[PDB]
Amino acid sequence: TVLIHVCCAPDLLTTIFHVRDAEFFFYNPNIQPLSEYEKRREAVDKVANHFSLNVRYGEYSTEEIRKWYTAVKDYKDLGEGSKRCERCISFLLERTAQEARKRGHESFSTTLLASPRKNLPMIENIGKTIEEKYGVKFFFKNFRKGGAYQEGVRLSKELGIYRQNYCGCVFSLLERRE
Ligand code: SF4
Numbered sequence: 001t002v003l004i005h006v007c008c009a010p011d012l013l014t015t016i017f018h019v020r021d022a023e024f025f026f027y028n029p030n031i032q033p034l035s036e037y038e039k040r041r042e043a044v045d046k047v048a049n050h051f052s053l054n055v056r057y058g059e060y061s062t063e064e065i066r067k068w069y070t071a072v073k074d075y076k077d078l079g080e081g082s083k084r085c086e087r088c089i090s091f092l093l094e095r096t097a098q099e100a101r102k103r104g105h106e107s108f109s110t111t112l113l114a115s116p117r118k119n120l121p122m123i124e125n126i127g128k129t130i131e132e133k134y135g136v137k138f139f140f141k142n143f144r145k146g147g148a149y150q151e152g153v154r155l156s157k158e159l160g161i162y163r164q165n166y167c168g169c170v171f172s173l174l175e176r177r178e
């Protein structure tokens with residue numbers, strides 16, 4: 001069984017075309033502000049209710065956001081896709097692997113593998129590094145392949161799923177304004 005970190009509902013929709021027996025873990029203290037976290041969480045809950053998915057919701061709090069910010073802050077000034085995102089994704093995947101170990105899952109993954117903007121080699125390297133640390137296997141898949149991304153777009157539209165326009169953190173929201 002696999003515990004799959006969930007970044008957002010659109011990428012969850014792409015992912016569920018391929019995976020069938022999973023526990024999902026919505027944990028994203030990198031999403032600010034709270035209103036945006038809740039909007040994204042509610043979209044995930046809408047997908048989970050529609051398809052009867054098993055989703056666990058992680059901690060979101062001032063303390064949790066401060067732990068994330070500490071992990072990325074020395075690279076604030078670098079763009080998206082830089083060492084800042086390496087730190088951010090490792091932070092999220094480390095917590096996911098910890099949860100997988102605690103809940104008895106032998107494997108972990110992330111719906112970030114389905115996101116068209118993310119760097120697959122970077123994510124696979126992070127996942128394998130965390131696998132070696134925790135002893136939970138990282139499951140890699142080109143989750144966009146088999147045309148699954150466009151499959152996720154179609155289901156997002158039909159179900160009326162919120163599709164965000166910035167990665168999630170305050171740095172990415174500023175970079176949106178340019
Ligand atoms: S742009 Fe996305 S991956 Fe990069 S630090 Fe911000 S939330 Fe994390």
Ligand SMILES: [Cl-]
Nearest residue numbers: 007008011115
């Ligand atoms: Cl995302």
Ligand SMILES: [Fe+3]
Nearest residue numbers: 007008011115
């Ligand atoms: Fe996503």
